[PDB]
Design a protein around this ligand. Sequence first.
Ligand code: SRF
Length: 254
Amino acid sequence: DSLRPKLSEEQQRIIAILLDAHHKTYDPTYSDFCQFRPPVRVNDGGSVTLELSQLSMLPHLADLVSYSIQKVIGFAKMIPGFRDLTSEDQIVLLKSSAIEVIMLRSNESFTMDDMSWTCGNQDYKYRVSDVTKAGHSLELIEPLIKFQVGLKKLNLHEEEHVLLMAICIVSPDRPGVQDAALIEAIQDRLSNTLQTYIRCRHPPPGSHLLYAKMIQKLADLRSLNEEHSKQYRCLSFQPECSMKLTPLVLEVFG
Ligand SMILES: C=C1CC[C@H](O)C/C1=C/C=C1\CCC[C@]2(C)[C@@H]([C@H](C)CCC(F)(F)C(C)(C)O)CC[C@@H]12
């Protein structure tokens, strides 16, 4: 049964644009990371009290996330149709999706070799213990690692990866959007591109229900987003926390 319509010229153009956008905004050598405030790892083999007292990994990770938010803003601006949205809707979509797109894009550095995000030598290898040294708890971290492994195991083509990040950003069901119908039309154009790509271009057996597995990952991201936000709120009560973050991070997550 399953018909396999060919990608339209327009859909091929969308894919080309998104790939180019990603290649321009995601440096796979991590060569800027030496510009961030340095990673510091206090001895904490056991402690929430110590973690909050020092927040040793927070300046480095806040700089990494802040940099990544900048990159995602750039990426978003290149999504076909995004600039047709009002400025207010653009900003609502970016602020609401930022953490989720950071989680998706990080999958590229994530490695199942040792369940880390590996971005160079030891200094820029991030493990669960680094995230706890930035003031988060295992209610966020363990589902985050489970999410990274589940995504890695879909073995997405880069085309599918960039479409998934675009679909995440252009979501009509974010609080505070004004033109939900326009956002939905943009998202549907991207979703249709993805569905078509998978059916034409993704060999079996990895194509089996791949679209539905990808839409499930979007739902998973909502849950992580909510948990991150709850934890960020608590982290923000720590005196002097603001100096360890950045203005962009404070705005997006405040
Ligand atoms: C962000 C990327 C993209 C480029 C590389 O691929 C490396 C990479 C890794 C992303 C990583 C590895 C380090 C921990 C990160 C940043 C997670 C952490 C829960 C964010 C916490 C926070 F948001 F920083 C804060 C403010 C303390 O709340 C979310 C994504 C994770």
